[PDB]
Amino acid sequence: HDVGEVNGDALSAQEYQNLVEEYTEVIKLSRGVTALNDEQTNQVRDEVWRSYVNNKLVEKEAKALGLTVSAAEIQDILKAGVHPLLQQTPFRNPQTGAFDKDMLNKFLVDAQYAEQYNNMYKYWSFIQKTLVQSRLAEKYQALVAKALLSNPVEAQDAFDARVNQYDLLMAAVPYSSIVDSTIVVKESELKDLYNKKKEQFKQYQESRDIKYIDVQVTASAEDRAAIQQEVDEATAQLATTTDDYTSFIRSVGSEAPYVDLFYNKTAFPSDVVARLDSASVGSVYGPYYNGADNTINSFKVVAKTAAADSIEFRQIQVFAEDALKTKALADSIYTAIKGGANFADLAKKYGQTGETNWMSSAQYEGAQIDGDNLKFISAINNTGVNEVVNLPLGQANVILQVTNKKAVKDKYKVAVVKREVEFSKETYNRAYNDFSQFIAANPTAEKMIANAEEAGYKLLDRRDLYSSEHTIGGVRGTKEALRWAFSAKPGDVSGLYECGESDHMVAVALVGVTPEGYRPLKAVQDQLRAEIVKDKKAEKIMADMKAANATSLDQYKAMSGAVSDSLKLVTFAAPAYVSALRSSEPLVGAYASVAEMNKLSAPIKGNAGVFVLQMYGKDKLSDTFNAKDEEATLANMHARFASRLMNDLYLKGKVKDTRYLFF
Amino acid sequence: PREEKAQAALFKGQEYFEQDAYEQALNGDSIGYVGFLKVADEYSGTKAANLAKAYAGICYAQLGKYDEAVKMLDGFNGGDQMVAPAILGATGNCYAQLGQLDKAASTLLSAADKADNNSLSPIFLMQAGEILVKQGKYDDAVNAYTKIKDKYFQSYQAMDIDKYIEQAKLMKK
User: Fold this and answer.
1) Structural domain total, chain B
2) Cβ contact B120–A645 (<8 Å)
3) Measured between beta carbons, which residues in chain A are less than 8 angstroms from residue B166?
């Protein structure tokens, strides 16, 4: 079982698993976090697949041409250190911070194991394969692009099209002057145009058309009243609480845990922040509902203060064989410091730097803080500048000296009772029962579409669903329903999928399949009809112009529905904007570039109408022609126009993507 | 291992070429890279030496040496979708630089047929169409441009192609 192919070479689910594995570790080790959610993981699956496909496409061409990235070139790139991919790298010189190739040279010598953070070899192995794949693609692209030369005819034309400017009067009849229902479009004409243009209507990947119902279960009134009651009881207890807020706030199961420390305003829930100025120290700010996270809440400002946000301090830790020695040793060290011994000197004596450091409340804001961490951080915030303290920390001691305090901000302790208004199981079971009764009573697409409204369900619509989309209707956990949709037959109705975050229910009706090949006539009917209509309107207008024997500008302006305009500084290069038509008309410049002065043109079929043109003036920008500069601009234009060549390699690469059949 | 050595002798020229340093890509630097001409002679028979002829031909054209460009570009042999048609298209553009307009137009039309794709065929068809218009061959220009409209309708050039068809029709007169 393989997840896809390109160029007749398949990728097995095993290798695909390994690469998405590889890429996730790399994504976590670079965005900070240590796990991603379901939609981020899907982004990672798609990047790995996209990257695999593009490199396979390039490799088949590079192999034919003999484009390679040799080991010598890799060494050259590595020694240089300037490739964008070698910038935000682990291997950096300790002082410069830039890529050092020399420390990278790492040994092949690792109960002979010790430690296994030398799975770093797999990380660098990824950076290096990305390097060579990207260098290969770049070599290939540059050879194509730089071969797209210009020439002097194309350079002279581009200059002429820009600097020759024309001024012309216009008379036009807009297409809107003819009512659509007066033009007859026979089915034989739609079929003829379709067959004539059939190669324009390819369907490259199979798509399907579905309807689906997406139910979300939300708390009932009795559900919300039961949680309002629990917050009311917790608010009354919070009012009569005077200490041990950490344990009380945990004991009522708040979504917002309490730490006995001062934090900036920003550390608290945004709905709490919004209310802090109206809150008084020691008074519960009574129950309130917050829509943005569906919670009922109350809180109590335990205390307010102005204190330093940044604290400078040096320290020295004291561990010894036992408790007796630890205490004796820490007391001796404390004595020396208070007598004026140098901190750095004494700290060296027990194998520590003893250099001052800084600490801001942002480095612990948000973490779970307890035990020795809470004791330590409380000690730093309650020690005066230059004061020394001997802090006992369970097993150890730490001699601590605060040297400086800056960034005095308003800080707070706030005990928050936050409870989400969740639905009961009774509520969920009612919704599940109603939905299953509806599905079973309407087990065909015809019945589901006809009866959804009367049963109270919103029938949603999705055309051209592709099997690479992961979900139905954006709902989390519906990849099974997508799988089902691509194996069902038109008319079928799926089962009830439980999805979302245990709060959504989805059913899917399959209404149509558009297999790979050609899009059917019906799928492109509207675009074909509109083209046929425009062509027939233009025929009618030009027929009316001939019956009127219109031979001068004034006779054209006298026809039913005619508008006129004066078009100045027309060029071939840039399409003329025509106020009278509210439309852009590139054929104006085409005509003007070869027109005779003061001669009325024949009727021209434009975008918004049929028009005639009569030029009355001409001039040139004064720019000097420079063939080398014109050609360089055109050459770069060619490169831009061909920058999507991977798409063409894709179309000939016979790429198949069966990832949805497995994950 | 002849191909491996040839590929190591080539890669520095591929760097110069991408930085528009065409003289050193072509004739070598003085610090170990010998240039495309010497790669193609020293490692003849390898894919690297075949590639070196395409690179050298583009170098000559960028340096204004279009006769040498044409001879060198002809030495490249390939049949892929992208590089080989672009090299043939580059040859047609060098013919245009030398005033051989008939040969330029037929080469470019050939490059477009060999490429047969949205990224390259319309570039060469436009260039052929403009040369055919300069020669007064308006019906042939209309056929080149119509090919962009009919077969390469998803290309950027197809968005703008109607003004070129109309101008060439109007010059029949």
Assistant:
1) 2
2) yes
3) 587, 590-591, 604
For A72, the closest chain B residue by CA position comes to: B8
Would the CB atoms of A68 and B90 count as touching at under 8 Å?
Answer: no
Q: Which one-letter amino acid corresponds to residue A371?
A: G
Strand pairing report for A609-620 and A164-174: antiparallel
Nearest to B94 by CA among A632, A149, A159: A149
Distance from C-alpha of A650 to C-alpha of B163, rounded to nearest angstrom: 31
Residues B38 and B72 in one domain: yes
Q: What is the resolution of this structure in A?
A: 3.0
Q: Is A441 near chain B, with CB under 8 Å?
A: no
CA A427 to chain centre: 35
Q: Tell which A residues from 218 to 257 touch B, by Cβ distance under 8 Å.
A: none
Q: Could you give the angle at the alpha carbon of B93 between the alpha carbons of B89 and B99, nearest 5°?
A: 145
A229: phi then psi, degrees, rounded to nearest 5: -60, -45
Coil, helix or strand at residue A277? helix
Quick one: which of B55, B76, B57 has its CA closest to B67?
Answer: B57
* Chain A residues closer than 8 Å to B135 by CB: none
CA dist A19 and A196 (Å) reads 45
Q: A586–B162: do the CB atoms touch at under 8 Å?
A: yes
Q: Which of B2, B7, B39 to mutate to test the interface with A (most CBs of A within 10 A)?
A: B7
B166 touches chain A (CB under 8 A): yes
Q: Which two tokens stand for residue A609?
A: 């109408």
Please identify which residue in the block is written with the tokens 């829930």: A269
> Which residue, A256, A254, A277, A255, is CA-closest to A265?
A277
| String of DSSP letters for A79-144 | HH--SGGGTS-S-B-TTT-SB-HHHH---S--------GGGHHHHHHHHHHHHHHHHHHHHHHHHH
The H-or-E segment that residue A77 falls in is helix A71-80
Among B160, B163, B172, the strongest candidate for a mutation testing the A interface, having the largest count of A CBs within 10 A, is: B163
B130/A contact by beta carbon, under 8 A: yes
Helix (H) or strand (E) holding A574: none
Give every CB contact of residue A452 below 8 A, 6+ residues apart in sequence: A213, A438, A442, A458, A459
CATH, domain A205-218+424-515, list 3.10.450, 3.10.50, 3.40.50, 3.30.160: 3.10.50
Q: E strands along A126-199, which residues?
A: 164-174
B63 part of contact set with chain A, CB < 8 Å: no
**Residue A215 β-bridge partners:** A505
Please report where in the chains the tokens 């060098």 appear, as a residue.
Answer: B94
The SS3 assignment for A205 reads: coil
Same domain, B112 and B157: yes
The amino acid at B74: D
| Contact (CB<8Å) B162/A587 | yes
The helix or strand, by DSSP H or E, that contains position A369, with its residue range, turns out to be none
Size of interface A-B (CB pairs under 8 A): 144
Contact B58 A572 (CB under 8 A): no
Does any CB of chain B come closer than 8 Å to the CB of residue A72?
yes
Specify the CATH number for A164-199+526-620; select among 2.60.20, 3.10.50, 3.90.930, 3.10.20.
3.10.50
Which residue in chain A is spatially nearest to B85 when comparing CA positions?
A144
Write the CATH number of the domain with boundaries A223-420.
3.10.50.40
Substitution target from B83, B126, B154 for chain A, most A beta carbons within 10 A:
B83
Whether A400 contacts A313, CB under 8 Å:
yes
A648 shares contact with chain B (CB less than 8 Å) = yes
Which letter, b or e, does each residue of A273-291 get, where b requires 16 or more Cβ atoms within 10 Å of its Cβ?
Answer: eebbeebeeeebbeeeebe
The owner of tokens 């600490």 is: A359
